[PDB]
Design a binder for this molecule. Sequence first.
Ligand SMILES: Cc1cc2nc3c(=O)[nH]c(=O)nc-3n(C[C@H](O)[C@H](O)[C@H](O)COP(=O)(O)O)c2cc1C
Ligand SMILES: Cc1cc2nc3c(=O)[nH]c(=O)nc-3n(C[C@H](O)[C@H](O)[C@H](O)COP(=O)(O)O)c2cc1C
Ligand SMILES: O=C(O)c1cc(=O)[nH]c(=O)[nH]1
Ligand SMILES: O=C(O)c1cc(=O)[nH]c(=O)[nH]1
Lengths: 311, 311
Amino acid sequence: MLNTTFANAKFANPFMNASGVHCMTIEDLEELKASQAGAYITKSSTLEKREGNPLARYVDLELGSINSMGLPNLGFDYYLDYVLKNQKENAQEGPIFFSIAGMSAAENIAMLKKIQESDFSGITELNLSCPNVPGKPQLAYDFEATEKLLKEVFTFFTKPLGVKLPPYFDLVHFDIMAEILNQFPLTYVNSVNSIGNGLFIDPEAESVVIKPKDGFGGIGGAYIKPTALANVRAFYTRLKPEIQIIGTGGIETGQDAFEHLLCGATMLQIGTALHKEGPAIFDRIIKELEEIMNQKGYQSIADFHGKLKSL
Amino acid sequence: MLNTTFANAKFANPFMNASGVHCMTIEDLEELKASQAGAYITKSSTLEKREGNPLARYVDLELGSINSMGLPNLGFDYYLDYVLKNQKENAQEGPIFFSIAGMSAAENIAMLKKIQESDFSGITELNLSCPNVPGKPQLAYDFEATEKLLKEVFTFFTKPLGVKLPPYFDLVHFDIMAEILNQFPLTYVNSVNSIGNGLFIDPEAESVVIKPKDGFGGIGGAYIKPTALANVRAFYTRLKPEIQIIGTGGIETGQDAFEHLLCGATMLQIGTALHKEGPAIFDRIIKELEEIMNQKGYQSIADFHGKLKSL
Ligand SMILES: Cc1cc2nc3c(=O)[nH]c(=O)nc-3n(C[C@H](O)[C@H](O)[C@H](O)COP(=O)(O)O)c2cc1C
Ligand SMILES: Cc1cc2nc3c(=O)[nH]c(=O)nc-3n(C[C@H](O)[C@H](O)[C@H](O)COP(=O)(O)O)c2cc1C
Ligand SMILES: O=C(O)c1cc(=O)[nH]c(=O)[nH]1
Ligand SMILES: O=C(O)c1cc(=O)[nH]c(=O)[nH]1
């Protein structure tokens, strides 16, 4: 019942990991491949391998998570070599998704050229929102710099490309961004990365709980669902239908997933809850969603996709 | 133990209602005066009375609230006449706070000129984040327009003035705004208004839960505490010490208040939790904070104010 078409490919169900979670090593990626996820995405990579930030850099909270990982990753070539070899042995009803988060515009262009030049036939996700690098305004909060980068990208990049966006909080920003993105042949937008630079405090110790950046980190989980649904819905009513949506933020239960799909998401990614539970989450949440659909008489996601009702 | 000095005035404790909650009529305001709040603030006003948005416009949520009130208020002259008459009968160890939220730059200047010309001797709060008017980018997300307005204001306004800001999510935005505000003789900044334009869905009805704006509204409560603490802390390490801070966002318990004061807030405001519980919240949360302080050996807020430790 959760069969999905996205970016002209067929998936068994819309669920994926969110970039950054369970997707750093080839071993992690093979575990996602073995799970019941519909599709999976690599850790956002940079040209050089990176150790990332000092530890403690991820903390589980009652209502979600806070992190400032610092883009720890094994480097672009490691992920590219893995996906290229995994295309060479044909199996996943499913392109692999490949996230990049260069430390500059130049680095993102350089990685996109290598992807474009390679045989990669999967789907690439450009991270415009990589939030826990110290010293850089999220690129997707600078509308002019975003537009300039995308213009340069689409002078050469003809393979399927989505962008990973930070949350926006003002309807006029949704208007401005949809006007920028609508001029390109983008495959998708992925809404939302972490809510940026929140703070969690241990009141007993009177201190922050993560080490980097004086304790400020991206917030995920149940704290952010209201903003994530809003971002998915607000782009769903504004983007051209050529650009589809991946919804990420606060997905733990089948009900949370239902809600993103009702707003207009086509694939769904799970971050915080997958961190906590491990890839057994995918079997649990697919069953929760199917049970919701069965109670409502729904046999396919097209029965309620995008059909959130106003009052 | 909770005696506080702020804006050169003395208050019995730092707690207040947040603007918008329990502060629309004279009767509401007299109930906050009667309660144990240390101080209180009026509903944001406009020059003309406004009925505000269609109903359902406020909803209680398990983790906070969503609202799109539309700035329902009884109009500037009604609040000004009330505070002016309440200054005339001398009592509150405590200036009243007066919030304004003009529908334009002109209306805000017009109301500020009336306050400056009146005998008002309390404190004014200029709302730069009034989020549920349909058709207007939050003014405080437009740094150029914010700076231009504040420049004009401080050509004439000599009385104690604070600004109510929306949450920021990028450390560079904290830098830009602190640079703008630090050039003025502002009394305070009040961080945070709601998280803007979030969405809450009833999955059984498959619809949004508030009427105006296709169900998008400001989010308050426990959802937003990580963001509000970050915004208080980030302005506390950047603002000149002349500009003090009011923390608002997700305060329900003594521990939540403790955390905001640890970040640097001097006064605290309670929105969602006061909506739910009514003015008896002030007695409860004062006692909770006092108990935390007693357990730590603290006899005054200065023992821990702003002393949040990094790792
Ligand atoms: C541990 C961690 C690492 C993250 N790293 C990335 C990453 O490399 N790239 C990406 O685009 N987002 C990353 N994020 C953001 C997630 O992809 C997702 O957008 C965020 O956690 C919102 O989802 P959630 O509520 O399910 O956690 C990361 C999140 C987590 C918790
Ligand atoms: C019912 C509603 C009305 C609001 N109206 C205003 C108001 O007129 N002006 C103001 O500056 N903020 C208003 N806000 C925002 C609150 O002052 C406070 O910034 C927001 O609720 C965050 O606090 P909380 O987590 O304690 O709710 C209102 C909030 C509530 C829920
Ligand atoms: O690796 C990081 O810290 C990271 C990247 C990103 O895009 N989002 C986030 O929450 N963490
Ligand atoms: O009146 C409104 O809707 C209101 C104004 C404000 O500044 N903040 C908010 O949450 N609601």
